[PDB]
Design a protein around this ligand. Structure first.
Ligand code: FAD
Ligand code: FAD
Ligand code: TP9
Ligand code: TP9
Ligand code: TP9
Ligand code: 6QK
Ligand code: 6QK
Ligand code: MG
Ligand code: MG
Ligand code: MG
Lengths: 585, 585, 290
């Protein structure tokens, strides 16, 4: 039984109704940046003794923090901004949350109702602007609609395929006195009728049957499996089917497990991509057949019977046609199949040892590899050391680029929601704020932002947030003085012709620029730089052992390339396995 | 006769066609941040020997720089970004340019045409998203359309009421070989038929007539007058009518001129607001009757015959009904009226001395004022010193908040395009990047970003851009450790209850946080802090005399309020003239 | 009710629109493509592996054959009155099922679908998804222009027919051999049926005649035809029906046959909205018992 700070018959501001509506959703943390159009909301927030506000230094930091909060916990992330420039500063986060299917509720203040459409002070039609980059949005036009809409917003954001929901709230609505009705029924009759049903025994028996008849099966696991860690593991134990994971699916099946093919795709491993290429049964669980994974669709799993289980009916048959499909929660599908697989275990005689040995050969002939040049630090090695010293238990957030891929390749994630990274939109500057949200959602955890120098500086202002909020956020900055991934493509496809990818100062070309240590010092965050590989192990340990926030500037040679690589729209035969940005002797 | 780097019969990439299309528009500077979807464009940019790219550290910095470039020169500002997260990072700038009517052309890369709508890697429907916050936008669907669309984009951005135009360019279009036709005719038959005609003698004679019959006329001048500096001055000489200016219109009529009422509106002067209140003739030139100026519309110029000259037919009669209206270029209207006013000069006998004396009394009884507390620095005084030491010749860009208003109140702008500030959208973090664009457009000028500590830190990453590009950008940072303007409203309307407006560290409460000097040091930019008013004059001089970029951290007491103030939706009788955030003894 | 539809069947869905697969019901097996090509591929396999497959569904067919004999389509004949079902059945016989049929929307549309044996596709032209009245007569026009040597018959209701009655002018002027088999029940029949079943036969603006002259057929559709120089006739008694339809068919060019039917007729069987197979209605009409 919820306890209000108001009498049930007592009028209160719409702003107070809004905040209590959040309290009744179990919300404990918001990321709100004040402005004139949302002042009433912020006033109401201070009256709450259960909701903590983490004030960012930029609303993009605010929404990315909400994402990190969400991704690291499975809870909805809540960000609040003012009208106009506040609202427009959320846009990248909204689009990011939609593409990566992250449960998120964004609240924006709006000009008074009567002034909407008049090009008023700090007015943007944010509902119009964000309609195509949110799961759903609202423009509250009456104070009485606030409880219902907030309930619907959280329901839509967290149910089915999770996503961002924006609620636009006019200032006069926030100010209006009213008595809220919390027993209002939601008006989503369409959405709820099309909610996926629990999987029939019929469908699951067919899949189990296909498994018994296959000789080269491969699991194709993605971000839809984040809540199915135990079920998937039980499934793998019963079937003995090797597991290939997407960038979004990392951790669902532990990376350092015997049956793990690690990541597939453009920068996926040779053996993972090999497995899918030569499979005769593809179990696509919680994936969306992205071009970054498939390459040329006609060549992707060309000789495999494809089973696709997705909670979104719109995703089934979108890019590739499955032989067998199940529209529902993959968690429930796995449970049903595990039940069948265990009863008919001796009847089924499942053994894919021959297939596993075939893949095991590829894993030993073409493993992940990096080269060490003199005393220079391999970025791959640095991440591998972080793994060892954190015992693979750290929550990792990243920016976007080479460092992001290396973070995905050379860290063994033992559970999902250890890996927080922008995949679909691939938005730089995501790393640092996401770490903030992750740390608030997981106060007793090791949180490390593995960032690139380009990505890090975009939202560098959030270092202020980290110090002020006293968050134990560790920044492992892999500094190659370049926009690394764009640089790599320049090397491969444009004859190494640099087009605005160098991030240092051309005047002082051999100096590391900017001095990221001084950014940290500006915000009272202890920091250090490491250049020689010998000093690296002790440096990372110092970062970890030093209480509170810490920045480690890891200097890396920029010529490093992410490998292997299947070029855009390519096939497995097009895979690149060797080479970097260095010229031969 | 333009010179191409290609034979007229030679096929070239769409990316090269695009860049040459820019060259043919006279473009010399772009603000482009590379990404996979725009790499071809960036490659093409390096082949240009006439277009300089200023690489920002954030696309929001990129578009704001383009704005500063535009606002300070009257030329269109050009920013380029990649697909997805690049494009969405432009959104605040686009909305800003639309509301402030700034000529701007934004180019974004897009996923290949065939992949549009498939939720591809780094795909946002940016055209859909930005339709309501741009003057117009395009999605290029054929390489042959590139020359025509670019011509249309620049034409639309710079003609009529200036604004932002976005051109979305799919990657495969950039790669496709083609032979461009530069003689293509534009397809804007609707837009061009509704382009305002030159003002008839009929309309102008009527206005001149009203002037001769009025006894209390007031000029109401705004951002539509930025190109009419000489004409307006000639007009004032002939009529002797006092001039009230909007935030956007500063500089159009010189502030330190005898007939200047300075700024009107919410934080306008008492005498400027008085003049409009008691006027019997209101000459609204290049204004849009904003709520921030008018307050309660029914009370605004309630006893005045209103003349409105605007280049947008949609703006006439929108919020207030004019007695006389002219839809056209105010520059041409002024010329026509000046011609009439000079011929019929002795016939007209214009003399408003009585009205001027009446206003002159108000100007002496209720002038702009600030208080000096001990050795502390009044932010108002600091800006007044910058005026003196730059002889009012500096180009000023600001963030948004109290410092913005003080920059508007206590600096005497002698020409338009000295004042670069976000007015309609009021977007924080605008100051520093705008200064960058202004400095590139005006290399031999004094460029000073008068910023607040909240606004400054939002795009602090652009300090890297400033050092790398070696721009003589001066930052006059007025540091009150607060979100000042929100703080002021808290003091006035919420009993000084702080709701997330303090920007320092609560643990070390009396320390200035963050240390902005170290941000500057991180980017190799010389910097200093000044706290005592005695040291202020020499400090600002040092900033000015030191070659290249410079940061001056000016520490101000946070209790300062912007005065005077007409509360939201209020009238002239509601004006607040005294008080701050300090408690009495 | 979707959950009850083919509840115990493995569902195979072949559709050329990827958006339609799994939209309302989840298939066990799906193929996105031209069903024409799918059939060709399967036919090839089915013929080669024919003796290997041993296909025989005689038991299933007999089970269904029992249902077909216990619950066939049925209509009742009242005195000398014309059953609309019977009229359509006679048109079938006299055209040898070779006619192109267009219809309006309503009861007559269903009876046209139930009691005419279509031998080929594109013989049946009817608004299904939108179900737009007034479709019949103009569709017949287009059909006749596209098929000049064919028998084209618009089986129309009196409500649907009058909506675009102006196109009779088009038919005469263009000299199109369009036959109109107008099943006239003086009502918006299908809405009337739902009134009988679900609203206690309470008439809410479904009668299309003139309440003043209640027993007169209104309007006089023959005069609409005469206005456009189209030969026409009315038939009321079932005995005269066979010769009347033949006359319509044998008379060169456009022709209107006003077939007067008792309005109490119901389309059967009927599964109510959102219902299941157990909810099927097999008997009853708009008449009260003795
Ligand atoms: C620089 C860069 C490089 C990249 N390269 C690669 C690469 O090499 N390999 C790679 O894999 N990715 C790569 N990506 C990421 C890629 O763009 C996509 O983000 C990713 O491939 C798609 O993730 P996903 O297929 O697992 O589906 P997601 O995007 O994670 O979406 C989840 C899917 O599962 C469904 N689902 C959600 N919840 C449930 C549920 N409870 N039950 C059932 N289904 C559910 C959803 O409907 C959705 O279809 C890269 C990204 C970047 C920025
Ligand atoms: C914190 C804050 C406080 C503010 N308080 C104030 C205040 O106290 N006082 C104030 O004035 N503003 C204030 N504003 C700014 C305010 O929101 C608006 O930006 C401003 O009042 C409107 O400017 P404008 O009326 O001159 O028209 P603009 O926004 O500058 O638009 C120009 C108008 O002139 C027309 N026009 C353009 N070109 C031509 C041409 N060639 N010929 C003819 N017409 C043309 C356009 O169609 C348009 O209608 C504040 C902003 C902020 C961020
Ligand atoms: C510019 C770019 N991509 C285009 C781009 C632009 N802007 C945004 C917001 N996001 C993206 N992804 C990349 S991956 C390079 C980032 O470089 P980095 O952050 O220093 O990381 P790294 O050098 O390891 O590749
Ligand atoms: C938060 C806010 N307005 C809400 C807001 C939020 N986010 C953006 C991008 N823009 C605005 N205008 C203001 S004016 C306070 C800014 O404080 P400051 O930059 O330090 O300047 P000052 O303290 O002089 O008022
Ligand atoms: C009103 C109606 N449906 C609503 C309706 C309204 N308007 C149009 C254009 N189409 C439809 N389907 C029907 S089925 C009754 C039509 O009666 P009819 O044309 O005389 O045919 P019948 O009496 O056999 O049912
Ligand atoms: C925090 O300082 C400021 C300043 C200001 O005008 C400069 N308005 C606001 S609030 C606002 C915001 C948008 C629209 C509107 Cl109509 C309002 C309003 O209620 O007046 N707050
Ligand atoms: C700079 O590094 C990267 C990486 C990458 O995939 C990780 N793609 C690109 S380019 C791109 C961008 C969007 C869509 C598409 Cl289809 C593409 C593409 O052409 O493949 N560039
Ligand atoms: Mg880098
Ligand atoms: Mg401040
Ligand atoms: Mg009828």
């Amino acid at each position: 039984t919820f306890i209000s700070r108001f009498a049930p018959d007592q009028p209160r501001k719409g702003a107070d109704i809004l905040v209590e509506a959040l309290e009744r959703q179990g919300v404990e943390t918001v990321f709100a940046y004040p402005g004139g159009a949302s002042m009433e909301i912020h006033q109401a927030l201070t009256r709450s003794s259960s909701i903590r506000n983490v004030l960012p230094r930029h609303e993009q930091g605010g929404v990315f923090a909400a994402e990190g909060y969400a991704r690291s916990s499975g809870k909805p992330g809540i960000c609040i901004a003012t009208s106009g420039p506040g609202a427009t500063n959320l846009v990248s986060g909204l689009a990011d949350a939609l593409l990566d299917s992250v449960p998120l509720v964004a609240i924006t203040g709006q000009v008074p109702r009567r002034m909407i459409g008049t090009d008023a002070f700090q007015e943007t039609p944010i509902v119009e602007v964000t309609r195509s980059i949110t799961k759903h949005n609202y423009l509250v036009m009456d104070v009485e609609d606030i409880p219902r809409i907030i309930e619907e917003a959280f329901f839509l954001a967290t149910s089915g395929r999770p996503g961002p929901v924006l609620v636009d709230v006019p200032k006069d609505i926030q100010q209006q006195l009213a008595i809220p009705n919390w027993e209002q029924a939601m008006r989503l009759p369409g959405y709820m009728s099309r909610m996926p049903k629990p999987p029939e025994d019929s469908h699951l028996e067919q899949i189990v049957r296909l498994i018994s008849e296959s000789k080269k099966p491969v699991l194709y696991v993605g971000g839809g499996c984040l809540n199915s860690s135990d079920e998937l593991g039980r499934f793998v134990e019963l079937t003995g089917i090797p597991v290939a994971s997407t960038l979004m699916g990392l951790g669902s099946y532990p990376c350092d497990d015997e049956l793990s093919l690690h990541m597939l795709g453009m920068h996926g491993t040779v053996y993972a991509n090999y497995a899918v290429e030569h499979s005769d049964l593809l179990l696509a669980f919680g994936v969306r057949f992205d071009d970054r994974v498939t390459g040329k669709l006609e060549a992707f799993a060309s000789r495999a019977k494809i089973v696709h289980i997705d909670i979104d009916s719109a995703e089934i048959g979108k890019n590739k046609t499955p032989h067998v499909s199940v529209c529902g929660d993959v968690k429930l599908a796995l449970q049903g199949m595990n039940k069948v697989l265990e009863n008919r275990a001796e009847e089924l005689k499942l053994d894919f040892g021959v297939w596993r040995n075939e893949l095991n050969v590829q894993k030993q002939k073409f493993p992940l590899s990096f080269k060490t040049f003199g005393e220079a630090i391999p970025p791959q090695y640095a991440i591998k050391v972080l793994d060892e010293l954190t015992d693979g238990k750290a929550i990792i957030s990243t920016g976007v680029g080479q460092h992001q891929m290396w973070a995905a390749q050379f860290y063994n994630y033992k559970k999902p929601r250890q890996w927080l990274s922008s995949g679909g939109l691939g938005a730089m500057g995501f790393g640092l704020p996401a770490a903030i949200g992750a740390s608030v959602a997981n106060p007793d955890a090791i949180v490390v932002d593995i960032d690139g120098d380009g990505s890090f500086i975009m939202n560098v202002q959030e270092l202020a947030t980290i110090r002020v909020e006293n968050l134990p956020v560790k920044v492992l900055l892999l500094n190659n003085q370049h926009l690394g991934m764009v640089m790599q493509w320049e090397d491969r496809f444009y004859k190494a012709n640099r087009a605005h990818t160098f991030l240092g100062d051309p005047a002082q070309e051999d100096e590391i620029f900017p001095n990221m240590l001084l950014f940290a010092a500006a915000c009272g965050i202890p920091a250090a730089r490491v250049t020689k590989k010998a000093d690296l192990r002790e440096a990372i340990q110092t970062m970890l052992d030093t209480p509170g926030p810490y920045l480690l500037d890891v200097i890396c040679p920029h010529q490093e390339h992410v490998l292997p690589m299947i070029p855009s729209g390519g096939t497995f035969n097009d895979v690149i396995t060797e080479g970097d940005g260095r010229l031969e002797h």
